[PDB]
């Protein structure tokens, strides 16, 4: 009900380490490929944790 939203901005993101160490049983992406995340630039990045 009170899920935490964190803004991610002004950083270079290496998603490869997310893959290297990962207890993440479910890794489901909707609008983008997981391996192309390292090849793209983004804004409006938000992490919602609950």
């Amino acid at each position: 009900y009170a899920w935490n939203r964190k803004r991610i901005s002004n950083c270079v993101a290496d998603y490869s380490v997310i893959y290297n160490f990962a207890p993440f049983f479910a890794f489901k992406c909707y609008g983008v490929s997981p391996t192309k995340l390292n090849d793209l630039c983004f804004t409006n990045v938000y992490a919602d944790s609950f």
Binding site: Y19, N20, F25, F27, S33, P34, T35
Partner: protein, 49 residues
């Protein structure tokens, strides 16, 4: 033998570590992927490396 969460990556077009540097499937692949747990046989208590 792979990890439990890497079973999604043995598929055509998949993103991963073992998909890129260990086992690659073609885009036009036909067939079936079978995955089953092997804790009873492929694990040891001190760590099976």
């Amino acid at each position: 033998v792979i990890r439990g969460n890497e079973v999604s990556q043995i598929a055509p077009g998949q993103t991963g570590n073992i998909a890129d540097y260990n086992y690659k499937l073609p885009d036009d692949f036909t067939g079936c992927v079978i995955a089953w747990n092997s804790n009873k046989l492929d694990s040891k208590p001190s760590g099976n490396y």
